[PDB]
Amino acid sequence: TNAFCSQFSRGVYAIFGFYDKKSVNTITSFCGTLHVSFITPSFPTDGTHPFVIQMRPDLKGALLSLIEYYQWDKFAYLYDSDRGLSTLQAVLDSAAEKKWQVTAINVGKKERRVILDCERDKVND
Amino acid sequence: SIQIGGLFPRGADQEYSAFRVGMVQFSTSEFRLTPHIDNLEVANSFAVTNAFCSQFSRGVYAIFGFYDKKSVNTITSFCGTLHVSFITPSFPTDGTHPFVIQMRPDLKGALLSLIEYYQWDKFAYLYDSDRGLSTLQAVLDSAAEKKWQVTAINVGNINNDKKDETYRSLFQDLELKKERRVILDCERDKVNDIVDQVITIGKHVKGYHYIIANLGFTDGDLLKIQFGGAEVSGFQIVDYDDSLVSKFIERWSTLEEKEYPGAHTATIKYTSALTYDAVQVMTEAFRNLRKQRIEISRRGNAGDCLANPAVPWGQGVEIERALKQVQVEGLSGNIKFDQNGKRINYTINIMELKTNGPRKIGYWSEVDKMVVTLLEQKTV
Amino acid sequence: IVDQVITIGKHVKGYHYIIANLGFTDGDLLKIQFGGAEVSGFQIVDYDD
Ligand SMILES: *[C@@H]1O[C@H](CO)[C@@H](O)[C@H](O)[C@H]1NC(C)=O
């Protein structure tokens, strides 16, 4: 908030930057309010929020199509709560239609198929 | 005079009414609580920030209010930074964040204990993302650990204008998987919608079991699904059998509707009761501060909330602890807080819906888990 | 009666109800519309005229 207000007070025409799941609402709200465009490599906003340019493309469709490609029915989905649950909720909503059995584990049954969904460092760990 | 800021969402009439009633009941000659009320859209981070900065610039000693999942991070961050204690009836924060006093007890443990009580290994979890996903993570971890079959579906994203079509569709999905057991962890209106659709399609008959996961079970409308034959279980944090709650209701049911909106009824939503209890907690907190001869009085103006660098006032911590050491008896039963602002040593009544109306079959203690409370045809 | 039928769940497929009154569309038909039961009635007011 302080950084945004500082950059705004300076009179910038645009703001490039990053946000977390705890700071995303501040960015989207303030940028939607002051008509100041925000550019970000971070995760796409969940919604239609304006004045936010997300460089990162959506991963939901490719992931679901990949799961359907390998013909997976039962698998385990590891997820980081520090990063977010959006894709998890997506595959959970898609689980009924595609007949999936998902075992969700938060990393923040003879299971041989695992989805990681984490930071590159956490993935490396 | 002790200046405090109130933050109320647009449309919470009964909560603000219970706030005023709580102000009248707990008023004293020792000191006088002076609320500054801000009615706003609680889901708006900008409005919440502006209101917070306003109350802070005014120099309030404490802030009571509500928050959504979109504005909660702002509250926790600003309160943790500027050391301004926040009091709330809303959902418990996911974490240990400081300067946040949550009146709402944790519902996850009671929910899990209820799931284990009916011995469910396979069910459906319908949930709203507006409060938090922590409970979802809980039932998922318990689904994995206890080897269950849970179908979690998010109904939060669906638009209300075209909603009945997707409802019919989702129920077609639930009739596909032969799902007869459903848990609603949703907003009361969302719960009403889902219930209405269940009734419409006829899944409210015998063989179906619904668990309404909210603090109040009797706060919503139970009459329409009462004679259906389906088992309906829920939770109740406000026990109307207590003499305190009995008297409070005796006065609450007679209150003027013109002056106090939604305050003429025999029942009260748990949020409003938690508001009342919150007023009580604040009163006791400042009373204890005055009893300990600890001076919290502001020397000068609090200044701008965005002042760089941000230096927190010193007595804020004193106020925070003063709020967290309070142990009293309210509408929500025993009110006692741990150091993180969470409710401890509370009791959540487990309710079942019968033909003669809702009935308590037991209760869930904070440490004791779930404990139960202890026309036939002829045989030839 | 409709509310009670819906409540107990007799508004599903296999049931047929005949409303004997001049207006069929005068009341709320939405609640028994998605039940699956066949519902027949009478209409003296033709809105197509
Ligand atoms: C809860 O607090 C009450 C007093 O308010 C006390 O008598 C009781 O022993 C406590 N129980 C537990 C389980 O902590």
Curated annotation (Swiss-Prot), chain C:
Post-translational events: Palmitoylated. Depalmitoylated upon L-glutamate stimulation. Ubiquitinated by RNF167, leading to its degradation.
Inducers of expression: Down-regulated in the pyramidal cell layer of CA1 in the hippocampus by global ischemia.
Subcellular location: Cell membrane; Postsynaptic cell membrane; Postsynaptic density membrane
Residue positions the entry lists as glycosylated: E38
Tissues where the protein occurs: Detected in forebrain. Detected in dendrites of neuronal cells. Expressed in the pyramidal cell layers of CA1 and CA3 and in the granule cell layer of the dentate gyrus.
Domain of life: Eukaryota
Quaternary state and interactors: Homotetramer or heterotetramer of pore-forming glutamate receptor subunits. Tetramers may be formed by the dimerization of dimers. May interact with MPP4. Forms a ternary complex with GRIP1 and CSPG4. Interacts with ATAD1 in an ATP-dependent manner. ATAD1-catalyzed ATP hydrolysis disrupts binding to ATAD1 and to GRIP1 and leads to AMPAR complex disassembly. Interacts with GRIP2. Interacts with GRIP1. Interacts with NSF via its C-terminus. Interacts with CACNG2, PICK1 and GRIP2. Interacts with GRIA1 and SYNDIG1. Part of a complex containing GRIA2, NSF and NAPA and/or NAPB.
Miscellaneous comment as given in the Swiss-Prot or TrEMBL entry: The postsynaptic actions of L-glutamate are mediated by a variety of receptors that are named according to their selective agonists. This receptor binds AMPA (quisqualate) > L-glutamate > kainate.
Recorded domain comment: The M4 transmembrane segment mediates tetramerization and is required for cell surface expression.
Family the entry assigns: Belongs to the glutamate-gated ion channel (TC 1.A.10.1) family. GRIA2 subfamily.
Function text: Ionotropic glutamate receptor that functions as a ligand-gated cation channel, gated by L-glutamate and glutamatergic agonists such as alpha-amino-3-hydroxy-5-methyl-4-isoxazolepropionic acid (AMPA), quisqualic acid, and kainic acid. L-glutamate acts as an excitatory neurotransmitter at many synapses in the central nervous system and plays an important role in fast excitatory synaptic transmission.
Listed name of the protein: Glutamate receptor 2
Organism: Rattus norvegicus
Residues of the full protein shown: 219 to 267 of 883
